[PDB]
Amino acid sequence: KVFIATANAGKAHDADIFSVSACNSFTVSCSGDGYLKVWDNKLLDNENPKDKSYSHFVHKSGLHHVDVLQAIERDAFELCLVATTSFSGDLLFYRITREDETKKVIFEKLDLLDSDMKKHSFWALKWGASNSHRLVATDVKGTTYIWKFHPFADESNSLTLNWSPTLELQGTVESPMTPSQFATSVDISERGLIATGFNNGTVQISELSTLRPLYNFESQHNNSNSIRSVKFSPQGSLLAIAHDSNSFGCITLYETEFGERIGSLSVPGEFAHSSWVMSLSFNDSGETLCSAGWDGKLRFWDVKTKERITTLNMHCDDIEIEEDILAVDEHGDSLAEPGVFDVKFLKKGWRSGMGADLNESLCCVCLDRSIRWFREAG
């Protein structure tokens, strides 16, 4: 299989674009300048993604994680909720709606957290859809938090679709080590497991129903050995972990019943990327894993064979509109091969236009302040 660029936007935010997510209706990015940007996914051929993009200021400290929940309630009612975390440690929520028939996006801030929860400094977050919805987040001190999301305050509201969301805290999972370390990443599986990655290379697996830690393991080994991304495969009992290993980027695979290391992904072998693997994203079936590297590459791996199928090399001049190419950074250094901060697979049908319809697609955000979309080709 191969992946081909379909649309992109250069100078898409005014500062680093650290995270990107998506739902059927749109792709959403966040940046260190403090803004969220929503990108309409139903894009007409040759249409400029920027034309249909909407910006919203969130917090002056900048934003480093975003995820969106697009709930389908009763087959006809859109509930699209963006959760985003700021460098200040705040966890903010916005309901995304569209104007009557202007298509103009409206962001409504929702106050869902209690005052005591706001005293924590949150880092990673992830929506766990359709199970009552679930939200998981970590804080910088190492704790993992789990809430149940409810679109209606009570059944009388549900019966009239009077959206009135609430976030009900289920509990927390404490870090396994002392002193506690920075929890850089988290994921929630479709089968009731939570994984939390730390900047010392440790990963802790917990049970979603009891909120009890099951076990914790270490990647292995002055140099950084930080975990950067943890993702459960949608199929089977596999967990992919991206982590630093002496200036290089690794991806190690683990079976989730006991946490045994069962394999690794690398290109002719030693490492997955020549620099850090910043993020990971599985496709819908879980047969392909895309990794985003600080080396400016997206690599696509066939999970079964553990082989790299294809590699896309990001370049600042990939940007279609010449005026939006950002060829050097603020220090004047070349952005010829911009590191990739995050990558996200989009479900079949989410992306419209540029021949993507009916094929799965992908989006990544890079160090040259760009956002790029690709479609899987035959």
Q: Which among 124, 129, 114 is positioned nearest to 65, based on CA atoms?
A: 124
Cβ neighbours of 313 (radius 10 Å): 11
Residues linked to residue 251 through DSSP beta bridges, in sequence order: 242
> How far does CA 118 lie from the centroid of its chain?
22
Distances (CA, A) of 334 to 9, 16, 249, 312, 322: 19, 15, 21, 19, 16
Contact 54, 35 (CB under 8 A): no
Residues linked to residue 84 through DSSP beta bridges, in sequence order: 66, 92
Write down all domains in the chain, each with its CATH number in brackets: 1-378 (2.130.10.10)
Contact 193, 175 (CB under 8 A): no
Contact 339, 296 (CB under 8 A): yes
- Burial group, residue 107, by CB count within 10 angstroms (0-12, 13-18, 19+): middle
Contact 147, 134 (CB under 8 A): yes
Experimental method: X-ray
Report the alpha-carbon distance of residue 207 to residue 195 in Å, rounded: 9
Alpha helical stretches, state H, 76-207: 155-158
Give the sign of the dihedral formed by CA 109, CA 192, CA 251, CA 309. Answer: negative
Q: In what helix (H) or strand (E) does residue 212 lie, and over which residues does it extend? A: strand 212-218
Alpha helical stretches, state H, the chain: 155-158
Breakpoints of the chain, after residues (C–N > 2.5 Å): 131, 221, 268
Is 81 in a helix, a strand, or coil? strand
Rg (CA), the chain: 20
Question: How many Cα neighbours within 13 Å face the side chain of 332?
Answer: 0
Report the alpha-carbon distance of residue 300 to residue 311 in Å, rounded: 6
